[PDB]
Design a protein around this nucleic acid. Sequence first.
RNA 1: ACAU
DNA 2: CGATGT
Length: 135
Amino acid sequence: EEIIWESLSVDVGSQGNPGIVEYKGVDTKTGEVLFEREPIPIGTNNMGEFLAIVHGLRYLKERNSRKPIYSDSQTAIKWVKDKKAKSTLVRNEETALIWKLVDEAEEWLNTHTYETPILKWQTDKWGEIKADYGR
RNA sequence: ACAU
DNA sequence: CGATGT
Ligand SMILES: [K+]
Ligand SMILES: [K+]
Ligand SMILES: [Mg+2]
Ligand SMILES: [Mg+2]
């Protein structure tokens, strides 16, 4: 119903899918960019969306912040809930890096705790998520 | 179908 | 138009 403005919004950007993947997190209220991942040469949209949320979790925990995270990805929200990214992406030499990051993100979730609410950004009502890349 |  | 996902 109401946007929770005191929150962190994340999103993925890619050139191709699968393709070059990056992600960022912003202050929902102001749009300030709080983190940005160096582009990863081959990944999927959903792996990027998943890593973005987990990074948000790590970022907010490190800073003792109880803010919620918004993501527009139904898929990534569920993967985080499950602590398991069910990506179809082939594992080979050119996807090794993204798969290393995904594996490590799952491992972080399985070894840490958090109370952060992970909320669905309601694109149909509110427009584009504030972390969107605009591609 | 929905979410990207 | 193509792909990633539940
Ligand atoms: K975009
Ligand atoms: K589809
Ligand atoms: Mg998105
Ligand atoms: Mg976007």
